[PDB]
RNA sequence: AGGACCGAACCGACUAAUGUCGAAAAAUUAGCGGAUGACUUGUGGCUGGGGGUGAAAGGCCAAUCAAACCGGGAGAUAGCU
RNA sequence: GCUCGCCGGAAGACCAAGGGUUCCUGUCCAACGUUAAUCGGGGCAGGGUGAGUCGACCCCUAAGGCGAGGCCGAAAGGCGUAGUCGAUGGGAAACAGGUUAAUAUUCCUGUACUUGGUGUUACUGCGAAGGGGGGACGGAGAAGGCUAUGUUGGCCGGGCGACGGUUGUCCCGGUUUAAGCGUGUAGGCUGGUUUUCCAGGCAAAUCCGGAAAAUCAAGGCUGAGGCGUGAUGACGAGGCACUACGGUGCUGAAGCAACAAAUGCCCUGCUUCCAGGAAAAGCCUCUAAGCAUCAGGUAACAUCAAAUCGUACCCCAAACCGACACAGGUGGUCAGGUAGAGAAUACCAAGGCGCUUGAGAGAACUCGGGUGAAGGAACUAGGCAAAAUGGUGCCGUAACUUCGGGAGAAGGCACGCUGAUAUGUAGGUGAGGUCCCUCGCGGAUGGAGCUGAAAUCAGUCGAAGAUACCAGCUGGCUGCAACUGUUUAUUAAAAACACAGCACUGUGCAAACACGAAAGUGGACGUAUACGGUGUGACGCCUGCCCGGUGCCGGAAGGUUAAU
RNA sequence: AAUUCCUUGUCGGGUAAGUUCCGACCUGCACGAAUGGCGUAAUGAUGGCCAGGCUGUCUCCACCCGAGACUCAGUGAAAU
RNA sequence: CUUUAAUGUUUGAUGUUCUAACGUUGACCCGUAAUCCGGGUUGCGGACAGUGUCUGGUGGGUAGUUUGACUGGGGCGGUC
RNA sequence: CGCGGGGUGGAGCAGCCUGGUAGCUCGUCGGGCUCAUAACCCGAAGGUCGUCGGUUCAAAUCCGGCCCCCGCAACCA
């Protein structure tokens, strides 16, 4: 639940958190815990490719069945953890048969919940199905691309894909951003909204509140000598150049989508 | 102040040691210049 | 609880004096700022020269940086001394 | 050798790193030492480093490196799989005392422990590059239980003391003891046990997990310290005895109690919050491929092995790094007395030193300082520098405000010692005695002894009772910036940068973008509440008009338009 | 005004005296709305100004304590 | 010569469909205890995508250079 | 000090460029409309083209001196 902390020190005064009284306290369920190597930021060369990102918390990765192949078998949510690589909440799903596995957490889901995968199971929140099995109309979440991949559509928090119609062998859905695309129908999804959808009014408040996530300080390119960037230079605040990125391609309203090969499954794009 | 130079031999025989030099191209010939000019001092170890 | 408060270790380096063939190729003395944090430190690695890195000064990259050092083009060229 | 002085959370005592004989002894004084030098980290010669338990090697991994094949690239070579390396990480095992000119948890004495081989005896199913458990872990905060350690008292030994006194509530010194084994507590964690079944765990499974039942209420794991034992042992102040007069040999009393108490230990705990906190092996355990009169495993015993290397000395410095015997820099550990909140600070203990040029003079002037009549910033670019304020409890405290603050605002009162309340209170600790019992490291009750604030009253001394060291100057208006923070190492610390927040725009995932001739990576083992770029920079009230020029986006009919 | 050249603009307050300061008037050489505008509690080793307090900064320096300077013995440079 | 219609022929430019090139950073198996890679089944795309050669455009991201002289110092103005 | 532009009925602006004929709107006068004004409709007058001189068949126009205004420049030590 979302909360405003009292302004007891400078700094503070502005944090907002979301306080969520169902997730477990304790630690993780340790069979599915693999190590996370932090990155930093550099490709093999060593070299930055991706700047701002370093620092941070070392956080350790909980692999996740995204694929959710098991079907038939009821399974029974156990307790909701915290995940610090995903902004969503990922439940721990125990099976009929004692397989443990953590899942995306919808919004409607508590402990001691059901859910079944599969084409045998019905149109209930949590539930797996093939696309062509839901009805048209309806939202979904964790859609996969090509059957069998995994699952790559709306799993951020809060996110949801609303399946718009469905003509036989391919689907037609409207993304999260406003984006008409089209999927073929033996692909999976998940029902229902991604829960932690309150994630979004969290004002992390502290400078330091960034640095632990693993934002780095970004410099603007105003305040660049113009051998370091395009933009820079002037004696006293001036700009008058052309915006773009620090390597001179242009920016604030310019389109870098060249695929072509996968151009055939978009329907629409955004506005 | 803290002078320019810490010395750890772990790190010098790691970097500018005999084996170091072995490994690449550029490196073998590093020890092939300094062999035709006779210097004794061939690397940097015991 | 706190990028919370006063304040040693520790780190940093605002003021003045001394020093400038110095004790020292930026220190000392008397006072300072932070001090549970974007903190600091040991050990060990990765990124490299028109490249690296940079809470961004054109600062740092072995006392040398608006382009490091060493060897080679090369006895460069010089209407200049 | 007798005095004086200095450090004493170091200028002490030990390791790593890094040096490389600088360690100790004899001897030498030319060269080195900023002075002389019989002195020395200087020359010459000799001696010294003793390990199954410390560390490295070794077993196993992290960041990351190399990388059979493989992919890719004019060549060089780059990336990377299985593997194989790489600690600052985890993993078997020892302490006390004595001894040297120098080394010793290494040598000797005493008492123990650990990993394996072989053999013997009695039992019994063993067995992987495979499964599971475990290893295995965050920050902060508070309390309890203890110890290192310290003080007092009892006791033992000695003294009764060069100017007045001191056989007494007087003085000084000592009162040290581990590893291991047994007991398994303060405390923490968790419901055990048995039967059946299964799409779970790349195969199997008696192990883990899940799903049904029965029985009973506890069992088990972990755990500092204490008490015994180790130990009628060692050590031990002081004497007794020989001096090459440096020290060696001999002998040896007391050796307990009470209280205070760590940043150490239980705690790699418990609670709580969030930014959500390595891997693998050793070990335990289940089986497959197979092997079964075997081989192997469990338990006890005997015996043997535990190798190679380092080990000296310095280690907050004349030995490392700075050209120097250089006022600088160098990570970790132990860390006492009184005062004190404290690792501040003052003076001391242990311990180690007086900084490797001195002696006289007492001028100007120079540096570090003490005090200063009257005035009190009139100095000056400017209150720069000095001076002053400075602690604790209590009283009291404005404008303004985001209602947290502002604020320790400002401004004040009491602070020493002695007696009394009380032959030391409240409180803490707590034996003996009494009683019970699921009988032990137990619980109630009990209260001696020990220790010990603060408040009040009364009296008294000095000019001064926070007396020393240590230890805020305060208030008013206002520019900029929100704030913590960061920056030109070596003239600039700010209004500059960052900042959470906000906005715009890009990207539908083999994503945009970036590195790379390529592959392949980072982005992300994330996926539009995500990620890149840009601009501005908390919060509050807002953010007007212009698409002519430039850029960008959209639509392409027409004109023009390269190669072909 | 961190912006105003002209200029020490004009008026008021502060002072015996105020080219700086604070509050206003608009004649904005040449402010202005995210190269953001106007305010803002707290914060600041920040900039300007005033007052109290306190003092050798000053009026105008005076004395004393140590380290040099000076003389003597030893050693023994440097810039030019 | 113009306007034009049936046929034959010639290539060009679009649209739909398919599978064989190719792609496949989808699932599965083996080499192999290996998420690289290769081969093999299959699904999905599809003669696109992408690569090479040629070519137009944008292009300070990047590099090599130019940026006059006289002048009562130079710049400015003027001149050649 | 230099460079560019400008000065036109009462006012604000074109026409100069590439010479012979000066235009638009408001303002003014007279008339009409209305009870009166304004507005509206109709017609007309109004300009030494800053000044002086020269060149020219002809000058607002091409050139030069001067007067007034506006902008830029008036810098580097």
């Known amino acids: 639940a979302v909360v405003k902390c009292?302004?007891?020190?400078?700094?503070?005064?502005?944090?907002?958190?979301?306080?969520?009284?169902?997730?477990?306290?304790?630690?993780?369920?340790?069979?599915?815990?693999?190590?996370?190597?932090?990155?930093?930021?550099?490709?093999?060369?060593?070299?930055?490719?991706?700047?701002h990102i370093g620092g941070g918390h070392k956080q350790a990765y909980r692999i996740v069945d995204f694929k959710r192949n098991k079907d038939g078998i009821p399974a029974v949510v156990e307790r909701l953890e915290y995940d610090p690589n995903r902004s969503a909440n990922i439940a721990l799903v125990l099976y009929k048969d004692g397989e443990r596995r953590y899942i995306l957490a919808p919004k409607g889901l508590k402990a001691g919940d059901q859910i079944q995968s599969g084409v045998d199971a019905?149109?209930?929140?949590?539930?797996?199905?093939?696309?062509?099995?839901?009805?048209?109309?309806?939202?979904?979440?964790?859609?996969?691309?090509?059957?069998?991949?995994?699952?790559?559509?709306?799993?951020?928090?809060?996110?949801?894909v609303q399946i718009v119609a469905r003509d036989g062998a391919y689907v037609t859905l409207r993304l999260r951003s406003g984006e008409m695309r089209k999927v073929e129908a033996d692909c999976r999804a998940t029902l229902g909204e991604v829960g932690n959808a309150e994630h979004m009014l969290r004002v992390l408040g502290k400078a330091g509140a960034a640095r632990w996530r693993g934002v780095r300080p970004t410099v603007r390119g105003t305040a660049m000598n113009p051998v370091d960037h395009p933009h820079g230079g002037g004696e006293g605040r001036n700009f008058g150049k052309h915006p773009v990125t620090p390597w001179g391609v242009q920016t604030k309203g310019k389109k870098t989508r060249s695929n072509?090969?996968?151009?055939?499954?978009?329907?629409?794009r955004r506005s | 102040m803290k002078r320019t130079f810490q010395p750890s031999v772990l790190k010098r025989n790691r970097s500018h040691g005999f084996r170091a030099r072995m490994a690449t191209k550029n490196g073998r010939q590093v020890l092939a210049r300094r062999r035709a000019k006779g210097r004794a001092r061939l690397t940097v170890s015991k």
């Not at chain 1, 099995?133 to 309806?138: D, E, M, Y």
């Not at chain 1, 072509?260 to 629409?268: E, G, L, N, Q, W």
């Open chain 1, 260 to 268: 072509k090969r996968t151009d055939k499954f978009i329907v629409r």
């Open chain 1, 122 to 160: 019905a149109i209930k929140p949590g539930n797996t199905l093939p696309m062509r099995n839901i009805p048209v109309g309806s939202t979904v979440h964790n859609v996969e691309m090509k059957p069998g991949k995994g699952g790559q559509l709306a799993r951020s928090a809060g996110t949801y």
């Open chain 1, 6 to 51: 009292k302004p007891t020190s400078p700094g503070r005064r502005h944090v907002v958190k979301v306080v969520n009284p169902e997730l477990h306290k304790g630690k993780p369920f340790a069979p599915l815990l693999e190590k996370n190597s932090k990155s930093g930021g550099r490709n093999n060369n060593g070299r930055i490719t991706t700047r």
